Amino acid sequence: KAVVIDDPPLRQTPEPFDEQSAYNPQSPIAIDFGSSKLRAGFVNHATPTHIFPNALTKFRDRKLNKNFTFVGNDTLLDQAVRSQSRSPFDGPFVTNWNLTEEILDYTFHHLGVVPDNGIPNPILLTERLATVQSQRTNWYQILFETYNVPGVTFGIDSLFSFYNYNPSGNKTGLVISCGHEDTNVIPVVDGAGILTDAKRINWGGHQAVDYLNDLMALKYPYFPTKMSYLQYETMYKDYCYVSRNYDEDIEKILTLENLDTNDVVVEAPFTYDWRNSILHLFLRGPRPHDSENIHEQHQMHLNVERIRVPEVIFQPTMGGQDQAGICELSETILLKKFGSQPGKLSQTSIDMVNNVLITGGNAKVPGLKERIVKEFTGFLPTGTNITVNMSSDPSLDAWKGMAALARNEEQYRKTVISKKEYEEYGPEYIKEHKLGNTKYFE
Amino acid sequence: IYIEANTGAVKRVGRSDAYATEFDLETEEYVPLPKGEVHKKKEIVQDVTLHDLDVANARPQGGQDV
Amino acid sequence: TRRHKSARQLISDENKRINALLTKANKLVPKATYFSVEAPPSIRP
The single-letter code of the amino acid at B5 is: A
C-alpha closest to that of A419 among A154, A132, A141? A141
Which residues on chain A are in Cβ contact (under 8 Å) with B37? 382
Q: Do A329 and C39 touch (CB under 8 A)?
A: yes
Write the DSSP string, C1-45: ------HHHHHHHHHHHHHHHHHHHH----SS-TTTTBPPPPS--
How many beta-carbon pairs under 8 angstroms link B with C?
6
Which residues on chain B are in Cβ contact (under 8 Å) with A247? 17
- Minimal CA separation from C40 to chain B, in Å: 19
How many Å apart are CA C34 and CA A128, to the nearest integer? 10
How many Å apart are CA A93 and CA A84, to the nearest integer? 20
- Kindly give the pairing relationship between strand B10-11 and strand B2-3: antiparallel
Q: Terminus-to-terminus CA distance in chain C, angstroms?
A: 49
Write the DSSP string, A346-371: -HHHHHHHH-EEEESGGGGSTTHHHH
Query: With the CA atoms of A396, A402, A407 and A409 taken in that order, what torsion angle do they form, in degrees rounded to the nearest 10?
Result: 160
Cβ atoms of A28 and A406 within 8 Å: the answer is: yes
* Helix intervals (H) in B1-66: 50-56
Tell me the Cα Rg of chain B.
Answer: 19
How many Å apart are CA A428 and CA A131, to the nearest integer? 12
How many Å apart are CA A417 and CA A65, to the nearest integer? 41
Helix (H) or strand (E) holding A266: strand A264-267
Query: Interface partners of A (3+ CB pairs, < 8 Å)?
Result: B, C
C-alpha closest to that of A100 among A71, A74, A68? A71
Helix (H) or strand (E) holding A30: strand A29-32
- Minimal CA separation from B60 to chain C, in Å: 52
Which residues on chain B are in Cβ contact (under 8 Å) with C42? none
Q: Which of residues 97-136 of A touch C (CB under 8 A)?
A: 97-98, 129-135
Q: In sequence order, which residues have a C-beta less than 8 Å from that of residue A109 and are 6 or more positions away?
A: A19
How many beta-carbon pairs under 8 angstroms link A with C?
85
Q: How many Å separate Cα A82 from the centre of its chain?
A: 20
How many Å apart are CA A357 and CA A432, to the nearest integer? 23
For residue B41, give Cα distances in angstroms to A80, A184, A382, B5, B9: 69, 41, 15, 10, 15
The single-letter code of the amino acid at B29 is: E
For residue A296, give Cα distances in angstroms to A5, A217, A340: 10, 16, 57
Cα within 13 Å of Cα(A251), Cβ side: 3
Write the DSSP string, A274-292: TTT-HHHHHHHTTS---TT
How many Å apart are CA A242 and CA A144, to the nearest integer? 44
How many Å apart are CA A433 and CA A145, to the nearest integer? 24
CA angle A199, A378, A371 (to 5 degrees): 70
Q: Under DSSP, is residue A189 helix (H, G, I), strand (E, B) or coil?
A: strand
Tally the residues of chain A: 442
User: Dihedral sign, CA of A149, A155, A159, A163?
Assistant: negative
How many Å apart are CA A408 and CA A124, to the nearest integer? 13
Q: In sequence order, which residues have a C-beta less than 8 Å from that of residue A127 and are 6 or more positions away?
A: A33, A136, A139, A154, A155, A156, A157, A436, A437
